[PDB]
Amino acid sequence: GGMVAMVFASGSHVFGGIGSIFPLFMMVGIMMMMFRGMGGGQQQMSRPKL
Amino acid sequence: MKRGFARPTPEKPPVIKPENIVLSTPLSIPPPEGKPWWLIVVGVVVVGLL
């Protein structure tokens, strides 16, 4: 968010309108990895083994 | 009239030697370990989108 904010403060205004799709998609991809993700050997019942 | 023939002590026949053999046990199929393929797929996209 700081990177997007820094560019906005500088006055580029490139993320206005559809350009914003780049930050938006990235923030979604990061969310998928940190919240669900996958467990290690301690969580033996990974979907393919069960 | 016939020729005489006296049977001597029998000559030694070739000795038979038995053998006890226990078969090897077949190999066991490696159980199905599985990689979290989707996780690394999202990764190269996020680093690429940056």
C-alpha distance from B35 to closest chain A C-alpha (Å):
9
State which amino acid sits at residue B29: I
Give the tokens for residue A46: 């990974």
Are residues A30 and B46, on separate chains, in Cβ contact within 8 Å?
A: yes
Q: Which two tokens stand for residue B31?
A: 């159980």
Go through A21-39 and write b for each residue having 16 or more CB atoms within 10 A of its CB, e for each that does not.
Answer: eeeeebeeeeeeeeeeeee
Judged by CB atoms closer than 8 Å, whether chains meet at B34 and A22 is answered as no
**Is A19 exposed, middle or buried (CB count within 10 Å of its CB: 0-12, 13-18, 19+)?**
exposed
Residues composing chain A: 50
Which residues touch A33 (CB under 8 Å, ≥6 apart)?
Answer: B39, B42, B43, B46
Amino acid at B45: V
Portion 8-47 of A in contact with B at CB < 8 A: 22, 25-26, 29-30, 32-33, 37-38, 46
